[PDB]
Design a protein around this ligand. Structure first.
Ligand SMILES: [Ca+2]
Ligand SMILES: [Ca+2]
Ligand SMILES: [Ca+2]
Ligand SMILES: [Ca+2]
Ligand SMILES: [Zn+2]
Length: 316
């Protein structure tokens, strides 16, 4: 909508107060003019027709419990935008400042969040398995990272390329959580998962096996469920990325950790320069090795650590 850029205030899903960039034209809309060609948040009104209505508010105050999911979707989209721009020199998901659109209040009791090819969509959860999913910065950044992948490598969402596509989103979702630096960790979705249970999440990158996911190639899922195990076999790549960053000895193989910033550089470069729609795990290892070589040199610690990390998870 055409109008002036304004600044509202509200509470997110977890009760935290924050400012949001809005736009004024009769009503105050969830439209942030300060990033690229805009970030726009819509209300799906418990339906599944998308996008819904651009979020409109009478007073620029967003403290109602109904407001909370939209506050977070909008705000964490902005944080994710800032991460790609400031860290990777990437302007929005297409690299050309595409508008970022999100809808909240999708369906009723919907325990999930996803990128539908054009926009973000967040359920409210059923209050037991999930609370509104946009309250998780790693969830927001995970799903926005699928948009980045769709415009770059184009990793097909099935089997190994699919598990890489998933891992890439867990990796950058986690790096975005560390960037924002509020209770960061190497698990996925903990802030919105199971309000009654402390310390759990959907997935762990540091120990995929915690939730039954493989942490080694010899444990790969080879069946047909979950598009050939895209959320299952990602554990193997997640563990490798965790090792590259933090270090550790995994099945007898020692890895020297090089830290989060370098992990982010190597994997962004693999994503955007080397990976293709059909890349398998072994091809990911070669892309990551070539990326680390471009960035730090062929004899570097960084290259040696990438090789050790993939050795540790059985990927040659
Ligand atoms: Ca209001
Ligand atoms: Ca966290
Ligand atoms: Ca997390
Ligand atoms: Ca929980
Ligand atoms: Zn995903």
């Amino acid at each position: 909508i055409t109008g002036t850029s304004t600044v509202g205030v509200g509470r997110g899903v977890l009760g935290d107060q924050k400012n949001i960039n809005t736009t004024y034209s009769t009503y105050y809309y969830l439209q942030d003019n300060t990033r690229g060609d805009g970030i726009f948040t819509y209300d799906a009104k418990y339906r599944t027709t998308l996008p819904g209505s651009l979020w409109a508010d009478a007073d620029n105050q967003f403290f109602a419990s109904y407001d909370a999911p939209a506050v977070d979707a909008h705000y964490y989209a902005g944080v994710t935008y800032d991460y790609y721009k400031n860290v990777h020199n990437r302007l929005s998901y297409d690299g050309n400042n595409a508008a970022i659109r999100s809808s909240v209040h999708y369906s009723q009791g919907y325990n999930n969040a996803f990128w539908n090819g054009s926009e973000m969509v967040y359920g409210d959860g059923d209050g037991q398995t999930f609370i509104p999913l946009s309250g998780g910065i790693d969830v927001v950044a995970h799903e926005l990272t699928h948009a980045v992948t769709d415009y770059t490598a184009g990793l097909i969402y099935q089997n190994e390329s699919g598990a890489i596509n998933e891992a890439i989103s867990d990796i950058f979702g986690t790096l975005v959580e560390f960037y924002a630096n509020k209770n960061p960790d190497w698990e996925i979705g903990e802030d919105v998962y199971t309000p009654g249970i402390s310390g759990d999440s959907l997935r762990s990158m540091s120990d995929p096996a915690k939730y039954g996911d493989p942490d080694h190639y010899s444990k790969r899922y080879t069946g047909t469920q979950d598009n050939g195990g895209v959320h299952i076999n990602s554990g193997i790549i997640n563990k490798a990325a965790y090792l590259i960053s933090q270090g550790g000895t995994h099945y007898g193989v020692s890895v020297v950790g090089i830290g989060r910033d370098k992990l982010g550089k190597i994997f962004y470069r693999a994503l955007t320069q080397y990976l293709t729609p059909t890349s398998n795990f072994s091809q990911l290892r070669a892309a990551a090795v070539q990326s680390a070589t471009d960035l730090y040199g062929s004899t570097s610690q960084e290259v040696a650590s990438v090789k050790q990390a993939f050795d540790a998870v059985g990927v040659k």
